[PDB]
Amino acid sequence: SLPDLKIEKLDEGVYVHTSFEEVNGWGVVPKHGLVVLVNAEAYLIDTPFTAKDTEKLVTWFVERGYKIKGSISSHFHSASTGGIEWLNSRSIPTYASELTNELLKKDGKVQATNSFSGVNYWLVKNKIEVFYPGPGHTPDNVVVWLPERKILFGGCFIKPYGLGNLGDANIEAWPKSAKLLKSKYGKAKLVVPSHSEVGDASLLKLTLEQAVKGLNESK
Ligand SMILES: [Zn+2]
């Protein structure tokens, strides 16, 4: 029995949702995503691994007066797209970049209903921006920046303590990508990694350092 889905308030209009999967090392590993409340509507930033937890997360907010306006998945792995099938099935708009949908399709997974490309994309005009620093953890990974609170959701592109699974990683490009991220969001007040506790802009530096170390230690 895996731990129960958790939903904790991180900042005004921002919640961190946490779900868990069983791996082959850390046994049970926590996966953090967010929920951004704009007006009386909620935007899911990454989905839980399963339909069960995505449903629990959706209903938690629906029962509090919030309509689910949509979800955005930061990379193709289930940790971020596990709930797209369920959300699609409820006609809740789901978003992913073209690269992500291509990896999903290729992996025989259901794709986001709405796609996008380019370095940056505003999911919600001046409130939720999606940024692509380039390949790192996976070919498609993106981050989501909330300008108002200065919060950066890094998903698993932010690896401040070690890079983890390199299976779909691009070790030679990760450094460049992390440099661009660090220059782009040095102003973040909070950086939310997928598997670790929340931190400040230092996580961008630390991620860069691990990426560099990883490239060096590869050749
Ligand atoms: Zn991943």
Description:
It is found in: Periplasm. Keywords: Antibiotic resistance, Hydrolase, Metal-binding, Periplasm, Signal, Zinc. This is Metallo-beta-lactamase IMP-1. It catalyses: a beta-lactam + H2O = a substituted beta-amino acid. With 219 residues, this protein is of the alpha/beta class. It has one domain: Ribonuclease Z/Hydroxyacylglutathione hydrolase-like (Metallo-beta-lactamase, Chain A). The protein contains six helices and twelve strands. The strands form two sheets. It has a seven-stranded mixed beta sheet with strand order 1-2-3-4-5-6-7. A five-stranded mixed beta sheet has the order 8-9-10-11-12, with helices on one face. The longest helix has 15 residues. The protein is globular. The N and C termini lie far apart (41 Å). The protein binds zinc ion (ZN). Zinc ion (ZN) binds next to loops.
Short characterization:
26% of the residues lie in helices and 30% in strands. With 219 residues, it is an alpha/beta fold. It has a 7-stranded mixed beta sheet. A 5-stranded mixed beta sheet has the order 8-9-10-11-12, with helices on one face.
- Supply the number of structural domains: 1
Tell me about the largest β-sheet.
7 strands, mixed
Globally, the shape reads: globular
CATH topology: Metallo-beta-lactamase, Chain A
Distance between the termini: 41 Å
Keywords: Antibiotic resistance, Hydrolase, Metal-binding, Periplasm, Signal, Zinc
Binding site for a beta-lactam: 159, 165
Protein name: Metallo-beta-lactamase IMP-1
Catalytic activity: a beta-lactam + H2O = a substituted beta-amino acid
